[model samples]
Target chain A: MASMERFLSVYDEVQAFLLDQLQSKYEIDPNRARYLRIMMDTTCLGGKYFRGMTVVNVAEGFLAVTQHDEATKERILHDACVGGWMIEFLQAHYLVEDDIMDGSVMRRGKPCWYRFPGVTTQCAINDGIILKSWTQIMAWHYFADRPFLKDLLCLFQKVDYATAVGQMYDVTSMCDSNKLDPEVAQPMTTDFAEFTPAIYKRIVKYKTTFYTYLLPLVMGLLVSEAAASVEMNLVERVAHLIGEYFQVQDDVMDCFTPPEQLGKVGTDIEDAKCSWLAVTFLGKANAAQVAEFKANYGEKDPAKVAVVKRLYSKANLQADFAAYEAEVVREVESLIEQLKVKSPTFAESVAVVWEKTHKR
Target chain B: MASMERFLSVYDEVQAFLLDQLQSKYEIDPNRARYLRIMMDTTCLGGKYFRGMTVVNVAEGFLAVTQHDEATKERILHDACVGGWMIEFLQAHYLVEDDIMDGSVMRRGKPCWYRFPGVTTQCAINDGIILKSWTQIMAWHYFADRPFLKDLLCLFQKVDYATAVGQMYDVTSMCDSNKLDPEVAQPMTTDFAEFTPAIYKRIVKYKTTFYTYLLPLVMGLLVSEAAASVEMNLVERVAHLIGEYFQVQDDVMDCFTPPEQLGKVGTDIEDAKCSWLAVTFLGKANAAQVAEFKANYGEKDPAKVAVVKRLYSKANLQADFAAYEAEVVREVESLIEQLKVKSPTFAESVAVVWEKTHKR
Candidate 1:
């Protein structure tokens, strides 16, 4: 608990520093300045800063058990947050690009960066690239003089590269599924074209897991006294599962929950995305319902989307989706319960996520 | 003669090696693969293999002065071309996004990377960012065991970062020009919206010199026996002049040259770019002509584009442009002639570029 609080303090400082760095430096072009400001505002404001906070938590845990004094913890936390911001920066990179890629005009209750007047999708993409570099530079600035700077830089670079790889794969997989529908829906597979909840779950997992789970968890281990041994692998795998489902539920809320509760419109179905709901229903919906669903859904029309949802309920699609979701949760729960010697910090994180899942 | 033969030999070898290296080892999705191939093909193709050949030449020149017993020079040549490929990779990084930003559909006789089938402007941008990392990795691979690898990497990175900085300014300048059009045009202030050939000239120098002229030139010096210590001040000034003209010529060719001569449709006019030609014409045109030009050429329409060209010719724009070109060439000649101790290689390069003037 104390480690979390200390990390929270350091994270607050990191956020403040990043904000200051971004705020005063954007006066190059009016649009660039404004575009940058919107991005900073979006990055700082949109996500709960949870992923970054986890990074700080790891650094703090590392310091608490290390040979060095509390003073060194500060440095570790600084670097950790710098890496955390690297992750944060990556999120913004995707957010800016994703809105344009998806052709969505709004993000997190505000106009997407490209939606700003005079800012085209191209400028938005460039800004997104710049944001990623800034994360690297800032991380370098914080860790450049530190003893483990090279290791820290290497770690974050791998994390960055891996996340980009995953993102690239996710984009390709969905696009391939959408555009390269070469297989005719035979007497059996015609229903395969229907959107299902299962597809959304996989998208969320791939897009979020490594960055969300592996990064922060490993950052904690890297900073901790824990040997880079089997224990570390165990933690990473545990965190990855947590992240996967955490993202799944988030997608679920984004797509199906009340607009007021979710605070955004669900356009995944419109985008022809193979989301969790879509994939699940493909498995769950009966043969007749599948044909109806395939015929009814898969366009940008609002009314057609409503019909799909109606069909989903009529066919008891929600119950099937819920059953699969419960199965995954139970699997993860068993893994967590079987941990030989849990770090309180990791345990608390698992509890927090599990609690949030129930609320959703 | 042997070096020339070897150069051609290495050229083919490098191409095959790169393509082989780029073979998708990772099981990434098709979309990412399609996106990457587009980026790589666009960057590596388009230009005459001249730059890469020049690297091989520079390395050979460096080796000639060395003891043939020191076979390292040949190795350096192979590595240098690899560096050249790194530079080519960098070009892709900038241009892919620029094409999207500019709404360009074609490049180098091929569809722009962002315009490729299954590639959209949004996802293409992320691919652009990843391309930067790939180049960095390639540079590391080639530069790893060399004595000056770190310095070379730093120099390469410095050039890259500086170019990105210049580009940042260029993008802002465009936005600024539009945002403060009144201040730019009426107030006659140094606003971006009021961009002139002068502004474009400066920008081209900043963005172009270091990357195009200074980078390859400096890089040539670094790996060659020739000490690269052309005074920083002098090199900067020369680079600025040479870079400006190169870009100006590029713009001029895009507009004035016949398609058969230039080998492509000029899209500078189509993109509504704040180009040197546009800026110069704005300054030179009569008041009525300016108004009519502004009406016709605000954002790239055929009627307005034709009218603006007609208006420029009416103002004897060809003569004016020719005079400007001649003056710049003369200035470069005088500057090069004044060099204290001209390296023959550098001088020869200057001579070859000068020959193009008479041909034109």
Candidate 2:
């Protein structure tokens, strides 16, 4: 909706706002204070900011259509930026915790915060908690005066709770992880019999969809006072479908993308994650191939992991993924098309929600 | 403040409020649902309920002094219970993470929630996060209708943020830790030169005081709309002194108290923690005793650990502790006595605050 630079610029202001408090207000150890400042910078600042940009655009979209004064517009923009970054902060919170839990090393092209010397898992554990607290504190700063403050707080917790449930499923599904070997000790799966489509969908919706896709959109709606326009049912339906497509894309990329280009190495097969590729491979596999899949999956050996990659290629996942992505795009398009026809007034907001995700 | 039973009874209501929403609201697995139900029960239910009871007392104290209808009194009691449980929830959040980070095995005489058969570190990590989210969500439920919702949210955050900073200092102060052996593989410190009284106080204030004592006191003040009477400075001053005493007493008990009596074994020596006992012993020690303390402090061997314990007794820490504890009690008493005189109208509210911590 606006230049990337405009959205990118506020990251510093939010960082500065929190950093200013560490010394003057909290009066903590200077080194620890500096560690927190860098922790926020390292984990939060590098992201694509797409999730945050969605918040900015949705808020601006509603503001554009509404009759607001210039001063109010400026205030709303600042609120949108802060709210958007809270979503980013939420992601950082997960990654720092997830890195310790997921055993991830790199995030956004650097060693994960926990990987940085002096910020071990012990410090990282509390660091992540601090990141979450900042969102609550910052929310109080930005939205305390608004009617939607409680609603905004409610929205954050709902997604946060939902995401943790999804994470539980994802973690619980890993049967026998060997913690010593990175390739085997990870939460990877060798068995397809243990999972189903419903399980995968639950994980995707809870872990990936709600926070990543649904949160920013709903946040924009609440912040802009435009939530009344769309049906709650419509928002979830659209977000789920879009979020599904996004996760599915991520699964494919986790296997296929170059490590540098992807910004982190993929461990879908070795980690035995319930990836869309593995789920699809389940239905397509013959007995011999299934046996091969089981052996190659969740292995520490490079050759075995390589075999899983070849098997993915052998199964032609790229073609399957493209068709599935195309199908989701059409499904959302049809859903929106009908929304415009049936719901009338709600279409504009949902349409903007679409372009934010689906647009080039 | 009230009968222990009354404070204890509300634990179930808070647990059920969260458990009911798992399946119908989030569509998670029933098995996973049951795990979460037990997780909350296991971690949140078993606590002594003192932190939680403090909230009820403060809120009730205010409600009693002010004018209100029967319906309103009933409502504040319910609010007080919910608000109280949120603090308990906050403590549970820390313990679950701390269990994994601290390598703790038993809590409340049972295996720590993370030590359960299926609830590994991965699930516990996310579970702890969800526990925190419940606090925010439940706060919205209890306080959103009130005018002080923002202040309530802000208070929870201030305490949460403050505690993490304290945790960072505590965690960061540990330099060389042997993580494999039961005793040495902890955050225990063999070195005392790294710390000072100022550092120890910061850890106690941020980690223990503000949340453990000041939070409930301030929550009472804010909830009752009685904050208008007391100076913010008085709340912090009293909270700091009381919190310091509480932690100092904890350090003394950690070594002296039996494991079963304490409900969990103390690992302060093995973990290389920045306990008050260690800091106090630093100044009180002669040269040979200092060497004995350092060598035996973080040792894994039983004899070495026993030696460290003997040195504490030889240093006559119990007598020293009694004097220090008495001194702190007098200091807080003096502060409150003057508060009653100088602040005039504010004394009643703060005196109640003193009674809550100081009263037999």
Candidate 3:
């Protein structure tokens, strides 16, 4: 695996490659080209780069085992950087559209792209589509002739479609009847109640797993010319477990962390989102507690929000979340131990992701 | 070119192909798949079929010139129908987003997808993205191994990007200041005034011609093994001129035609769209007429709308539109004549399009 310094250096290169692709290839009007350039710079950068870093790390790990020549390693790392950034490009576009649909005002500690001055929801929607188109264009430029190009394109399209479907379920679960009162509007508790553990798990797999964990690992393997070594069932099983835990951590952070550190105020509660906390709380609540929860779950009023917060404490969900986290970490460690025999480097790459989020 | 009846029959096949691709190939949840099927059935069908029809007609024309056997021609028609339906899928997705952005209510005589009961604007945005992904999937399923597959993918991506760019320009042209007033909201007529003939022509080329005209024509040619016969610059030149005229006709119909026939009330006036009527009226209006237009152009009140209509009549814009349509038809005829000498089948393919719009 690459060191943090090495990964960060390649990150710079990937950003440049994205801009270069946007400028040199797209035959857009000068005015539009300028607009898209700014959009890419503002919206696509500044992420945690976890998904992207995984791509670089996995490829580098594969290359390290196979290649002795330093020059070949450097070239492979460059290609890996391009592949890694493609994931980031994909994530950025999804965020642009997601923010608008969620009625989000802030992201990454700044105004969401749709909320930028002079930019309306209309602009954000189109901008998201543009971001996606450019990523594919970049893929075509870098990987069009490779034998694995078809695999990469198919993987990307499939994940993209799955993520969109997951989003549909998430959005559709919010009953529009609750949306009638703008001031007090929240998704229906009746809908949120349907988010049993099983449904929540499915959403995590489709919406978060494939693109976040599975894609980066597989992309790295494919781009490093080690695709034949990939064990699809094994990689996906581990990736899905890791992705589910990662989303659970996100749900906890949304409610537990401050807006300052989390970068955006948590709306999972207000939006009546099918968050881990909501589902778990629903499962543990007594009849009286459940009645109270139904009354206050989706309210935006400060007092009502506090009541929901109290209900979380009443259910002792914090301890439950800690236990859940510990269980996931144990499962992942066992999986990685098993994977070590087949591919130690791949195991290490997977371990790195688990380690980063095991606590949060 | 295929007869209108032949074209209509192929349209049905294309619609079915779209559904089959959605059902069999995509790795979506069973629950979400049902929702998407309804979306495809609701949003993608019922268009006038102009863009989709062009693909079939052009390919059928080329196949007729080369293939002597009826069986081979039928097989080729099936492939072309798939390609043609891909265009419709693309258009349907764009309309979903465009209607939301433009605050439209009705399309194809039904509520916009976003306005359907229980559907949120957020769902519509993601639905649009999903539609686009499925189109690419359908293309890959049918054409990935073909000789001109790269050409098809590249063509589709480029046109989609170009269309998004044009949409950005179109959406951004509507300054948010109009939206500040719900009752008197105007789409920034001040902005429309800046769109000189040159700028308006470019928007039409990017937003309308590439996807609406050039894409279908080139797609059919590429899929039918007629790549060498394509003269991109020549087709684009004629297509762009025809696209401009087509949009001009749409603008005229917005005001002149009954809402029942137009499928939606014309908000071009209230929304302050950069319509031909608005631009042409601006160009011809005297100072007094211009003042009158400024006051009445974007008003929703019927009496105010009447004032704008009266101003159009005072400036004799209807005669101007008729002359503009005639000039485009004559120019298209001349261009087609030149095209015939290069590729007779290609000329016939383009002529079919010209004949349909010459009356408008």
Candidate 4:
């Protein structure tokens, strides 16, 4: 928990370090420097930081980073912090671009990156490229010298590739629904044809799981120097379940979670995005309910949002979340125990994630 | 070079390999797979294959692929070809996004990726993300187990990061100049204040040199197993000169290289972006000619294009390029001989680059 606490504290330092890197890297392009400096502040602040902290959790737990003296220990923590913040950088990276793709207006209790006064979609897209690309620039500086550097950079790449494909699944599943935003004066065409169990699972597993759950755990293992001892197949097998659970929790937040706590307004219904509730409701729907969604969903008006929520209620979507949540916990229950004997670090890592948002 | 010819042949195989990898990796998301598969074809075709083919030239010219017997030789050639096409993937990657950023109509003599009817800005942006992110996966697939794979990976990612930062410089240098494209019915905001010598070189060297010129050379050096003895600073110094020469030639592509030869429309002038010629002309311009550019730069009209050209004539910009080209060659001799003493492959590597420029 100290590592988790310390992890949050390191946020400003890492932001400053990368900002300095941007400054140090390009003196000729101060406008880009100032532009990105503003963008970082816009995008990077204020998150629960569960994934990044989990990276530090494993480092302190398994890596035994506490064995060193306090000063040396702080140094070790700083390195893992940088490594973990790489994950955070990616989260900000995705949110920035995802906001553009989804036509999202806000994130982290503030205006989305593209929604900034002069920032428009073009500059915002270039900003996305910079965040993802600069992560590697910083990674090379800190981690590439380690014996495990290749593995870290690699797995980083692997997850990034998987995550993009996940996004591809998600966006395409939404089809042209995103193009016909409710505010556009265009009539809606919110199709539910692609919201099957198979497509939903692919998007959740690839988009949410690969980066959010698996990458942090593995990054921690590599940083903690326990990768050689750990069996990753076992790690991945458990993650497959938890990944689904994590995304469902996210979907639940889209409707149920308070905006104050969520630090953002929910737009899943209006944007015509795939959500666990949406998928399950479609599965549970009849002719009128399904047709009701087609006719009224993706509307920005509060009345249509209520209509969408009422569709979820009539279909007992709350019941689905409860049952799905219970089954996920029950399944991970056995996987976690099996994993405990094999990789205590990973087992504990899974436990940390399991408890992270079993949030009301 | 047979290696160069063989290099182009590998394009289809690499595309197919990635598509199959996509299919094999995710059975649940056939739509995503098909989407990316289509994107690969759309963006990847029509390249000159200069960078990709050069990966092989180093393998053959300096790494001495010819000495091997024909059977095993094809195996070696295939490896370099896959390695080479990764560079091409990133080229297609940048151009796709840059087209969006520049708000252009055409690329590769066809509709730009974002301009495709069904594929809007959001999907095109996602497509760009895949092209760069997916390169790492393809690299890991082919080059992961190799001895110097780490070096190649680092170099690959390094070039990618540098290239993105270069893009940041370029996209911002235009600074809403792109937003005011002459067709928008908005009067242009074509400012020349940012087009200084230092910023111009930074853009050309980092954007053009790293991905286009140096990356291919170092990729060959690492893949050929000559990286250990090669003092890369020596390689990079000469590389700086070569990249500058190559980029200057690239800038001239707008005027001299036919659109048919280019296979992409040149928008450096009309996009309101900085270029070697623009910088040269601005530096040489009288107040009258400087005002002339402010009046007509970034104009898309057939008539407006000729005024930009006529002003270039009045400023005698061709003389500037020839003199600049001659000094770069003089520096190439001065610096490259120093590199030659350090590693014969370093000099031999540029021989691959030199031939790539003139040959194309």
Candidate 5:
């Protein structure tokens, strides 16, 4: 499998192809035109691109054993990248509408797509559906040659269904939430040092691990016939665990990174997000501190982010979280290395980790 | 075909069926509980129901020629009715998003679903998508065995694509309106209109007519193996024109009907809706009257409704619109009478028209 940088580089060409398609064919005018641009812009920014990258890398892995030439590899890479970008496209659509539904303002440092200049929040609703259908069309049209495209489509659609169900639960949770108090208001249970981490794990499992990592990786493998050589259950476990570690790393990075570096003002605390950091904070924070944290959390004020950060610092929560993250990474890395000798495909999964964490 | 009363009676049964479905299977508490109720409510309310009734009638048209037992005919009617209802369900999804995005509030006799209690305007966005997937599940699980179920699914999907394209154009016309003045917003004109009747026609044509009238009537006949017996093109064209007229009647009805009579207050003027009345008003009202009409329109203003009525009265717009509607109906009745002698399937179309027009 190639490196993350090599996979990301393909996004440049993918964006170009997508832009041409949006402008030449999909662009209607003014209102519809704005959503087209918003769709393009959102797909370009704010994503980890890991799932898409795995698509390319896994496809490359298949070609490695088959002895396909550079041209064949390039073709396979294009298909994987397209599949990966589709994840971004599909996800952005939901988020755009969700932001409006939630009355959220900014995403990835800009006004939410629905709130773009001259565009009302209502546009977000239609734009979300359009984005979904567009993914279906692209899959059917571009990947028609792939033997397993139907299965791939069905799989992606199932992923979409799961994600949507999560959204349904999430939105219902928010709407029915009687209070903004982080303790009672939040559904994440209170079990400092134990249940909190498990809750965080499930959130990641439902949100990031399945659709963003496991599905994309295996789907890519399915498309490229890597499944013929590797056992899928093994790949699922490895990818999911790696995805969990990656999310933990993300939480750790988000805490240390400046607001400017993150591209948006910090709202994880304000939104009362069930993030790794929040769960870790729950695990480490004292009862009074948890109450105070709950009292002043989420988009209500800049003070929430500050207070949470201060409390997290005083409790050494950052250090605890970091330790947990490192342990997870080390365990996952050891498993990948041990499994590598069992199958070359496990080696490919190991390579996925090296490429993502190197920070290059 | 039975009378309009017979078809309108089905609404009670439909409502009961829908409520039971929600109360039983869709039971969820806390956050997601509101969603199921909102979804089913939106599906049941806010559509013409003309499509569903027409589907049943089209199948009944077939029974007159074929010597089907009473039970067989009843089953056919049920299948056709369900298919038609699916069209209405799908259209509500599209139109609700549209009404919200277009900033429309009232439809028929109640607050738009998005504006209902516990469901803020943002619900409209999600409501649209949930509606589509809801229909698909219903199709896959319940209607899988109908004779032309596969063809019906494919046909409905194509109809959706057409509607999406039209919706794209319809919203564009409103956002980037080509016509600021009412004069250019004719019902049928080469010059573009902004939320004008012409734009509404296109929206209703693709979104409402194809699925509602054309597909149900033609496809039902095709499924019944009566396609050769019925003139598909003639029935479709006739049904399309009548469906278009039916919508116009709805727009006109919205103007005068009260909450008790029609179900809600009217927003026909405030949103600058392009209905049959608007087309008639634009074609008849002079330059001075057109400006006066636009100035006095929208919600919460009884005076505005009265003033708009006065302007229309001066132009005799209501009478004029009614005259046109009557003329179209008369022509349809006459044409159907001739087609019946040649092919009795054509006679069924006449009875169907009466069933649609003379509804409760």
Candidate 6:
């Protein structure tokens, strides 16, 4: 509850910082001011904000142990909030493009920014570019003179590239799906054969893991420690484990969580998403079960959805998720235990994310 | 001819540099390697090398007066090429979005990148972001330690922001045109009344001038001089005057140049572009001439095109352009002459572009 309050405050601060920047430095041309305002409002404002909160939490955890000087810690806190905003900015950028590509009509119970009246697809494209540009600019503005700025910049560059690559794989995969049948003239939504575990893991790692888990945590560490002080390889290993678990949970929640709780209808089934449950169920299904899964997996009919849900029950994915959740928790704890002596705050930060992701 | 060959060599070198970076450092994920390769090939190649050449020309001219050491000159030349490539990358990024927004079918006699098979609009957006990322990465890679790197990065940021703002204005203006009539379901092809000269100049200054003229010259100066040694205000004034003239000439050429010569048919008329010729003709047109102008200005039919051509001649726009050309040339020469004593190389580089634009 305390963390939620803190997260909300930080979210407001970041939103204000972005608005002020746009109001002052970026709002040069009056013609674009309205569009820019809409962009900031739509893209940056609403989200789960897990990425941004992680940035702040990790930074706070690190500062708690490392900094004794009050003034220095306060300044670092401000900078950390800026770092948190950068993550939000990056996420907004990815979402803008992703929504357009996926033909998503609704986001957070509102029309996707691209679908809003007076906004065209071209505006969305440029706004996405602007969101990304602002993230880098914010990073440079806050930490240009820091000793670790180069490493931070490279981290951003690497994560952005990886996400883009992941996006390419997903996009091409969908395009390939669309090309499968000449007679239908529409993409096959129930093409479950290709959503293998290997491809699912690959997609999740590059698309979600690198930016969602590693970036916020790694950025916090890079802010607090010298490049040589942090063990990036180990950090990445632990981060990936957490990321995989988080994404799987998200997939599980899609079908299982109530729409009011999730805030949006689960469309992974209709969208033919490379979801974890779909992939894992495919791995376990026999020929008859596989045929049944394909018929019901990616469809809009409530009956079809119900059929797929029953199949999950028959396959006992709930039990598998429970077991998988425990495995991930154990792995995360073991990794944190190894790191606690050398970087206690970092471990604590990881634990915070781990707890939040597994709130179920 | 020798200059053209030199420009080609530098262009190839820049392409190789980009490919090598993508191949080596930027290619972290093998899945995206193919997409990255296509992005580079399609976006970065085949354009007229004017912007890139300006960078090299200014750098060469700057090096002639300041640097005497062979190795330092060679290094500066290499860096200048990188700067030139940066401009090309930025241009490619802008073009990808512009083509899509304009509904342009062909660019440089080839299908626009967005129109290519398997290349969705979303890929174009992300690829545009990647091109921009690579530009900054190149800047940081080559000039991170330089004192003026901040100024360079800021310059890149400012130019990008300005271009986007200009694009917003352009897009909104077109939107306004579409909103003018309820009877015509599509945006009117012959909406000439709104293409005022003030708006025309605003779009050109923000979109074409900043990136095309000022970016290359200012980047060249930054590479060759410390922050204090350069007078950016003077350079910007000179660059803007030249950029305005260059864009006007481009507008004129679109109406006058043959399809084969221009490499693509002039779509500015059909696109209802806020073109200089369109706006200028509207300024002189009486009501009957205005109606005639509106009837034929933004249509696809060759007869309508010919009608607009006759209207342009009737308005004596060719004579006006000749006069406008002379005045701009004289104004540019005056600006160049003021800087001749203080920065002869910079003056010469400006002269090179001034002459190129006035050759018509």
- Candidate number with greatest TM-score: 3
The CA lDDT of each predicted structure is: 0.60, 0.76, 0.76, 0.74, 0.62, 0.73
TM-score of 6: 0.86
Better of 2 and 6 by DockQ: 2
B-chain TM-score, candidate 3? 0.88
Off by over 4 Å in 6: A1-31, A66-69, A140-149, A174-194, A225-229, A255-261, A269-271, A291-313, B1-32, B142-149, B175-195, B226-229, B255-258, B290-313
Q: Kindly list the per-residue Cα lDDT of model 5 for residues A240-277, writing each as its tens digit.
A: 68777777776665666776666655555555566676
DockQ (model 2, Cα):
0.31
lDDT of 5: 0.62
- Name the runs in model 2 displaced over 4 angstroms: A62-69, A174-194, A229-232, A287-307, A338-360, B60-68, B175-194, B221-232, B286-311, B335-360
Q: Which one wins by lDDT: 1 or 6?
A: 6
Compose the digit string of candidate 1's lDDT tens values, residues A84-128: 766777677767766776677666666677776545554566666
Candidate 6 iRMS, in Å? 7.0
C-alpha lDDT (0 to 100) for residue A205 of candidate 1:
49
User: lDDT tens digits, residues B132-238, model 4?
Assistant: 87677778888767786777777887788778777766665655434532123333345677688887888777777888778887787766676654777767876
Q: Which stretches of candidate 3 lie over 4 Å from their true place?
A: A1-34, A68-74, A174-193, B1-31, B68-71, B174-193, B287-305
Question: For each candidate, what TM-score against the reference?
Answer: 0.79, 0.87, 0.89, 0.88, 0.75, 0.86
Which candidate do you rate higher for TM-score, 2 or 5? 2
Per-residue C-alpha lDDT of model 6 across residues B199-228, encoded as one tens digit per residue: 777778877888998898888777776334
| Rank list by lDDT | 3, 2, 4, 6, 5, 1
Against the native chain B, each candidate's TM-score is 0.80, 0.89, 0.88, 0.85, 0.72, 0.86
* Superposed Cα deviation of residue B333, candidate 6 (Å): 0.7
On a 0 to 100 scale, what is the lDDT of residue B316 in model 3? 90
DockQ-superior candidate, 1 or 5: 1
